[PDB]
Amino acid sequence: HMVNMVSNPGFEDGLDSWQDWQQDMSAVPEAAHNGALGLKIGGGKAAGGGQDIPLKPNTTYILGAWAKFDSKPAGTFDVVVQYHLKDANNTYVQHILNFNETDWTYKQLLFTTPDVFGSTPQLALWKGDTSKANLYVDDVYLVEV
Ligand SMILES: OC[C@H]1O[C@@H](O[C@H]2[C@H](O)[C@H](O)[C@H](O[C@H]3[C@H](O)[C@H](O)[C@H](O[C@H]4[C@H](O)[C@H](O)[C@H](O[C@H]5[C@H](O)[C@H](O)[C@H](O)O[C@@H]5CO)O[C@@H]4CO)O[C@@H]3CO)O[C@@H]2CO)[C@@H](O)[C@@H](O)[C@@H]1O
Numbered sequence: 008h009m010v011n012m013v014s015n016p017g018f019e020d021g022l023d024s025w026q027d028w029q030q031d032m033s034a035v036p037e038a039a040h041n042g043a044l045g046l047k048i049g050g051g052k053a054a055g056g057g058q059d060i061p062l063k064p065n066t067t068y069i070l071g072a073w074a075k076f077d078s079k080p081a082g083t084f085d086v087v088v089q090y091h092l093k094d095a096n097n098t099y100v101q102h103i104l105n106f107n108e109t110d111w112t113y114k115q116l117l118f119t120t121p122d123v124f125g126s127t128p129q130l131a132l133w134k135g136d137t138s139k140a141n142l143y144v145d146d147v148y149l150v151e152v
């Protein structure tokens with residue numbers, strides 16, 4: 008843990024640097040874990056957003072995040088680093104944190120990138136749950152160790 012690769016990782020600059028795929032995202036105080044703002048992804052449909060992050064090859068990273076649903080979900084909220092390999096079929100690979108908690112929860116995983124990327128890595132915040140539960144996420148981490 009030295010440098011955070013994620014731009015606008017605490018949503019303190021609103022939605023700056025975050026793609027909004029289903030127009031279901033807002034940066035609002037009610038969703039804050041730290042600072043003034045957090046990301047709210049509205050319940051009722053599957054929705055999310057993300058950021059393209061070029062990574063170094065052959066390198067070990069920690070992916071981490073804080074999340075909570077404001078109500079018991081049926082599915083999960085997922086934070087993912089995803090990219091294609093450069094191989095026989097360009098395998099798609101996903102390093103996935105799953106959340107279903109209604110208290111602020113920090114989760115983290117470790118992964119090591121391939122020698123060659125088949126595509127540019129993407130950090131996705133994917134609230135696949137389809138209940139009425141709203142999802143809060145804040146303080147996302149992607150750091151080389
Ligand atoms: O909308 C216009 C906009 O689209 C953009 O492209 C988006 C696209 O719209 C989707 O939102 C898409 O969403 C995908 C996520 O990126 C991610 O790939 C996600 O991956 C899932 C996976 O499908 C599967 O569900 C998996 O389930 C796991 C689970 O997490 C757990 O591990 C369990 O134990 O195992 C199961 C497997 O059984 O988990 C992953 C959860 O992250 O799926 C979504 C696909 O529906 O992302 C696209 C961007 O990458 C852009 O094209 C944009 O330009 C355009 O304007």
Ligand SMILES: [Ca+2]
Nearest residue numbers: 017041042044
């Ligand atoms: Ca914040």
